[PDB]
Design a protein around this ligand. Structure first.
Ligand code: W25
Lengths: 300, 237
């Protein structure tokens, strides 16, 4: 297990670590999070008590380095940093752990939720969507726009998701206009899977990352990307059986984890109704359809 | 955006634009079969593509062979319309290509946008006008060329005859839409009005009779009377 120590907590804040969250009071003796499961990416996220504007946070993998959080009173936020002196880092962690100044990552043994939400998410691919090469971790916040949003303004602070546009020359072969618009299999299988993503694992990883940024930060462009990647599969008549079965699993766990009270802002009625009831794959997402109909029947 | 009564003079400015009406593309007769089921038989149709400023009508005749062995013909007809409009645009010199294409039915928007992706600067717009272009097949010379066609064909017409020598394009379009609305509302009575004077004929190279200015005023009045008469009959007014 690994540890993200905190220099201090000078401002009252709600701290998220993956799907969990807890409140820290102003100047409370809080020095970080221990027992973080090795083998997965993680996200540590923040919402300030005095200013719920800007949710922000950091995607990281403790196998890539030793990371800690220190508040910056000039820029007014909790910043992730990397400690290159391992001896020094192990000493700081051991002292915080002995004084019991850390919360423990509260994973139930029966619970595979985090694995199920991040199965295909890899830190190296996160660092291509979120470009800041000098760090091994990646900063995301509620306001960051996507490359697609920007085309329709600071490029260094953008989310470089793969652009999906159903009414684009990339999506539509000259001479196959009706075919490609009504059945997006070409765009899915040749352009996206074979051409850009190389395999379904990378496609699902980006879909899962987009969902998590939508949910944890309220990042609107990420919600748009998540729905676009779902609709592209559902609107394709030819999809490998193993991709459809895996998509059903991915979506089930995402719908299961979504806060019930954010459904109105995180779920697009058109996309979901189209995908579950009108699309080529309307009968291929049995688990997702069942949870959606029982948890959010209003949306449908 | 959409084109309506507020921005109506836009139709007659110097930006080239075309209306596209797909109503008459896919046309059928419905009939009983020997076994007592119902079947359709397609008949030749047409795309009505009109420049409202100049009167130029690009009438693409849709021969029934284009439906052979195809499914979901009502959907296909929209895509075929868009394919043919795209082909027409590509066939025109650059300086004749439209800057806007206005579709009379919103279901044509996606088909046309998708076919026109190569032309990002041509705006594809709907309209809130209820235009009577479906009645184009009530114009005898247009119906005749459509029904006689044995293969796909494009025929060019000026739907305003020589009116633009004497009236503006706004007035010409208003006359056309009144005539077509009357033909749609009561075709027999409208044709009677237009042809009830044998001394006023249709020139070989025209679609409508050779009315003088004063006679056009009378005709337009009679067309308005016809439309109002039919409204009273319909609603018991
Ligand atoms: O004591 C320090 O040097 C800083 O407060 C600091 C620096 C690196 C860390 F890993 C850490 F948790 C705290």
């Amino acid at each position: 297990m690994n540890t993200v120590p905190f220099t201090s907590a000078p401002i009252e804040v709600t701290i998220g670590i993956d799907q969990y969250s807890f409140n820290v009071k102003e100047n409370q003796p809080f020095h970080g999070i221990k027992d973080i499961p090795i083998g997965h990416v993680h996200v540590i996220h923040f919402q300030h008590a005095d200013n719920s504007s800007m949710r922000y946070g950091y995607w990281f993998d403790c196998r890539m380095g030793n990371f800690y959080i220190q508040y910056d009173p000039k820029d007014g936020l909790y910043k992730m940093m990397e400690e290159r002196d391992g001896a020094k880092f192990e000493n700081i962690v051991h002292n915080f752990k002995e004084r019991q100044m850390m919360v423990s990552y509260p994973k139930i043994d029966e619970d595979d939720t985090w694995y199920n939400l991040t199965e295909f998410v890899q830190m190296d691919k996160i660092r291509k969507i979120v470009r800041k090469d000098e760090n091994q971790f990646s900063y995301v916040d509620s306001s960051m726009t996507t490359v697609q949003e920007n085309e329709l303004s600071d490029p260094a602070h953008s989310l470089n998701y793969t652009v999906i546009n159903f009414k684009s020359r990339e999506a539509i072969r000259p001479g196959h206009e009706m075919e490609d618009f009504l059945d997006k299999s070409y765009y899915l299988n040749t352009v996206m899977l074979q051409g850009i993503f190389k395999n379904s694992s990378n496609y699902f990883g980006e879909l899962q990352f987009a969902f998590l940024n939508a949910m944890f930060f309220g990042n609107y462009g990420s919600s748009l990307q998540w729905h676009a990647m779902i609709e592209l599969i559902c609107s394709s008549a030819t999809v490998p059986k193993h991709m459809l079965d895996k998509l059903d699993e991915i979506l089930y766990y995402q719908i299961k984890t979504l806060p019930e009270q954010y459904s109105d802002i995180l779920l697009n009625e058109r996309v979901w109704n189209i995908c579950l009831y009108s699309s080529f794959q309307k009968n291929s997402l049995h688990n997702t359809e069942k949870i959606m109909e029982n948890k959010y029947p209003e949306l449908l | 955006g959409a084109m309506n009564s507020s921005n109506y003079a836009e139709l007659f400015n110097n930006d080239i634009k075309l209306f596209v009406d797909d109503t008459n593309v896919y046309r059928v007769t419905v009939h009983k079969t020997f076994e007592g089921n119902v079947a359709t038989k397609a008949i030749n149709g047409c795309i009505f593509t009109l420049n409202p400023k100049t009167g130029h009508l690009f009438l693409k005749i849709i021969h029934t062979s284009v439906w052979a062995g195809q499914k979901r013909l009502s959907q296909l007809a929209k895509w075929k319309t868009a394919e043919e409009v795209s082909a027409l645009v590509r066939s025109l010199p650059k300086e004749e290509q439209p800057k806007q294409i206005i579709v009379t039915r919103k279901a044509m928007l996606d088909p046309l946008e998708v076919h026109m992706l190569d032309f990002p600067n041509i705006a594809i717009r709907p309209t809130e006008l209820r235009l009577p272009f479906s009645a184009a097949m009530s114009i005898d010379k247009l119906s005749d060329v459509v029904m006689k066609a044995t293969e796909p064909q494009m025929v060019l017409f000026n739907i305003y005859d020589d009116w633009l020598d004497r009236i503006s394009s706004y007035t010409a379009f208003s006359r056309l839409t009144l005539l077509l609305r009357a033909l749609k509302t009561n075709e027999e009575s409208a044709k009677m009005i237009l042809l009830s004077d044998p001394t006023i004929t249709i020139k070989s190279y025209h679609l409508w009779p050779s009315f003088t200015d004063e006679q056009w005023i009378t005709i337009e009045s009679q067309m308005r009377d016809l439309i109002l008469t039919e409204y009273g009959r319909k609603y018991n007014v």
